[PDB]
């Protein structure tokens, strides 16, 4: 199912960019306000960027590690799309170009990067371990799925707490949360994705052989801006001033110095976002403790 | 960071055994404060140094403090028993300790002065740094104590003097006395301890060693923690070439 875009809409949105205008009123370098809401259970997190709505759920269960890695636990990230985010998405389409890319960006940002301490997921070596699962649910699409998911996964992992397990011999003793408190996960670093969208205001000839560069780049594009772009760049960083991953899979040829500028611009955003996540986690912890005190008092 | 493990009960069971038997006292081991209070009241009125002797002896049964990185252990394991603090680190001596240097770089990144180097954010590299400085720390104190041992051994090289000694170990092959004046422990073998080694008896229950002195003929019972007069003397062993301090009690 296709999204029909008129010539008028194509010309208007592009011309607006030539006049430093974007429809939502943002700034070319302006990232959308990210809202993070935690549910009752640990690992339940809802991320909202403008109209974009994503929900992540962290879960874990006792499992056996692979033969190759007897000291490491299991960790998987699911990002199956559904027609709920729009009829443009086919139900279960996990092989489409954009889907596989998004799936690979998140994987290289969280899994491959070792954001989660999988070594601390091991209960007994080569026998029993924890299997952490991150399920991302794309509720409403207005662009920026990759950035929304990376925040949803990370906020969830940092908010999630696994039940205490004591092990004797073969036997496993899964302590319920009420009897003893659950244990948080180990996070080595906090990866954040920032996606750039590129627009060629002129023709291909002036992009390939043109002297002065004039390609437009905006941060965190909406759906309309996303459907009219000529190239995409997703750069992942952390507060430690290091690039976790960069992916410009083809698209509009872009100047190297411009791509470097984007990486430095993204670093200022990931700093604000990371601190934001941490603060919302503290307040959530203070909220749960204050209610625990008001529950014990009256009790 | 730097942690200090709580001492096992097995380490103090032998000390409390000698205390409850001879001096009729005990160390609580229930908590660090309990261990401190019971160690504090462990004092003999006839000899003020008795309390010091117990302290320097209960120090030998403490677990070795070690450096580590916060990702290697959980928060309750950050506990430092000897200081009773939830968390602790070395930071005040960069010049003579490399651990402080690491702490300095981490604090600089903590306040935002300068980004922390990648080498101090790698769990693998941090494990190598900790295991190294832990080994270098042990080698430092041992070399330091050995330096004291040599120079003190050279002071008593050609000198004999009746000093004050304290029995710290009682065995059937002899006794071990400590001289606080020189800070040197000595071993008195049964052959050089008394005459007629077949007449001497060792009671493990009371840690008592009864024997008849070479210059006497009266059965003397030597218990533990006793303040005894000891003649000091140094002699290099012709096999080990180590300056040992041969002690003869009186």
From Swiss-Prot, chain A:
Coiled coil start-end: none
The terms describing its cellular component in GO are: cytoplasmic exosome (RNase complex); exosome (RNase complex); nuclear exosome (RNase complex); nucleolus; nucleus
Indicate where this protein resides in the cell: Cytoplasm; Nucleus, Nucleolus
Q: Which terms are listed as keywords in the entry?
A: Cytoplasm, Exosome, Nucleus, RNA-binding, rRNA processing
Disulphide bonds in the chain = none
Q: Looking at the keywords, is rRNA-binding present?
A: no
Q: Does the keyword GTP-binding apply?
A: no
For this protein, the record's InterPro entries field holds: ExoRNase_PH_dom1, ExoRNase_PH_dom2, ExoRNase_PH_dom2_sf, Exosome_comp_Rrp42_subfam, PNPase/RNase_PH_dom_sf, Ribosomal_Su5_D2-typ_SF, Rrp45
Which GO-annotated molecular functions does the record name? mRNA 3'-UTR AU-rich region binding
Any single GO BP term: rRNA catabolic process
| Further facts | Present with 4800 molecules/cell in log phase SD medium.
Similarity comment: Belongs to the RNase PH family.
Functionally, this protein is described as follows: Non-catalytic component of the RNA exosome complex which has 3'->5' exoribonuclease activity and participates in a multitude of cellular RNA processing and degradation events. In the nucleus, the RNA exosome complex is involved in proper maturation of stable RNA species such as rRNA, snRNA and snoRNA, in the elimination of RNA processing by-products and non-coding 'pervasive' transcripts, such as antisense RNA species and cryptic unstable transcripts (CUTs), and of mRNAs with processing defects, thereby limiting or excluding their export to the cytoplasm.
Q: How does it assemble?
A: Component of the RNA exosome complex. Specifically part of the catalytically inactive RNA exosome core complex (Exo-9) which may associate with the catalytic subunits RRP6 and DIS3 in cytoplasmic- and nuclear-specific RNA exosome complex forms. Exo-9 is formed by a hexameric base ring of RNase PH domain-containing subunits and a cap ring consisting of CSL4, RRP4 and RRP40. Interacts with LRP1.
Stated name of the protein: Exosome complex component RRP45
What organism does the UniProt record list as the source? Answer: Saccharomyces cerevisiae (strain ATCC 204508 / S288c) (Baker's yeast)
UniProtKB/Swiss-Prot annotation, chain B:
**Protein's name according to its UniProt entry:** Exosome complex exonuclease DIS3
Q: Which domain of life is it from?
A: Eukaryota
Where in or outside the cell it occurs: the entry states: Cytoplasm; Mitochondrion; Nucleus, Nucleolus
Covered part of the full sequence, start to end and full length, is: 752 to 1001 of 1001
Its biological purpose is as follows:
Catalytic component of the RNA exosome complex which has 3'->5' exoribonuclease activity and participates in a multitude of cellular RNA processing and degradation events. In the nucleus, the RNA exosome complex is involved in proper maturation of stable RNA species such as rRNA, snRNA and snoRNA, in the elimination of RNA processing by-products and non-coding 'pervasive' transcripts, such as antisense RNA species and cryptic unstable transcripts (CUTs), and of mRNAs with processing defects, thereby limiting or excluding their export to the cytoplasm.
Question: The S1 motif domain covers which part of the protein?
Answer: 153-250
The UniProt record's further free-text remark is: Present with 606 molecules/cell in log phase SD medium.
What family is this protein classified in? Belongs to the RNR ribonuclease family.
Starting at the broadest rank, the lineage of the source organism is: Eukaryota, Fungi, Dikarya, Ascomycota, Saccharomycotina
How does it associate, per the subunit comment? Component of the RNA exosome complex. Specifically part of the catalytically inactive RNA exosome core complex (Exo-9) which associate with the catalytic subunits RRP6 and DIS3 in cytoplasmic- and nuclear-specific RNA exosome complex forms. Exo-9 is formed by a hexameric base ring of RNase PH domain-containing subunits and a cap ring consisting of CSL4, RRP4 and RRP40; DIS3 associates with the base ring of Exo-9. Interacts with GSP1.
